[PDB]
A paper describes a structure:
Survivin is a small human protein of 16.5 kDa and is a member of the Inhibitor Apoptosis Protein (IAP) family involved in cell cycle division and in apoptosis. Survivin crystals are weakly diffracting and have lower symmetry, but they have potentially stronger anomalous signal due to the presence of Zn2+. Survivin Friedel’s pairs are slightly less correlated in the IBG data than in the CR data, but this small difference can be attributed to the uneven sampling of the crystals with differing quality. Multivariate analysis of the same data consistently outperformed the univariate analysis. We observed the largest contrast between the two methods when their performance was compared on weak diffraction data.
The test proteins used in this study are human survivin and hen egg-white lysozyme. In this work, we analysed continuous rotation (CR) and IBG collection methods for two different protein crystals (lysozyme and survivin) with different symmetry and resolution. The main conclusion of this work is that Friedel’s pair observations are not independent and it is important to take into account the correlations between measurements as this can improve phasing.
Numbering used by the authors:
A (entry chain B), B (entry chain A): 6 to 140
Write the structure that this text describes.
Amino acid sequence: LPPAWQPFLKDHRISTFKNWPFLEGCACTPERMAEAGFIHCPTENEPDLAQCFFCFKELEGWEPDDDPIEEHKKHSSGCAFLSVKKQFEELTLGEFLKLDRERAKNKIAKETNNKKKEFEETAKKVRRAIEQLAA
Amino acid sequence: LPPAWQPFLKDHRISTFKNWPFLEGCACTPERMAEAGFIHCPTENEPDLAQCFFCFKELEGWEPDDDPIEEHKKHSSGCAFLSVKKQFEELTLGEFLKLDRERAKNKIAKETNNKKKEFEETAKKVRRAIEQLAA
Ligand SMILES: [Zn+2]
Ligand SMILES: [Zn+2]
């Protein structure tokens, strides 16, 4: 199972949850999260944050009665994965190759938006410095 | 796509035949050879030979009116690709994964069959060595 293309695997998605806080008795059990495409991205801050393997929308603020499907459609209506209804081994390689192609795109988008924000930041920072020489 | 799984792609197989002699007017064009599962694995000592990427039978002695499917069905009936009638992107990732399972099998078979042939070889050298030491 080619490790680069593994996140299409719900069990792999489940395995990503290292010490995911919410378990039985909760509605966003990590199964329900992986079922929604999310994977665990624990950090120093917000160790509750997960990311959709396909659209890459990141999401925290998780409470036990949050429906990870409902939060995925809400914060990332454009996610193509949400539309996948068949199981993985049930996709034709035509469909699957279209997904991984779209997903790689979604990944460039995340990177592009990110470089752009990092740029505007250093942009804002330099004009402030220049403005200060007017004074 | 994962380079180990690239020979499943007809176009990839076609791309293999570099300096293949038989071209227009021939029955074993690199088109027909690839459609038949062959891949060009030429050597200095056998620049004619192609190998089925799936069952691993290798075949030289190619003449321009050879139909590589009929030469395939001939020398390796047990090859599972021959029964693959669907196009590639129409397989379910389930069936596709089943094939590569069998193909990995076929490669191990070839490995042992080869390890065995190497052994009977060095046996012969050892038997003939001993016999000469009788005289
Ligand atoms: Zn998504
Ligand atoms: Zn074959």
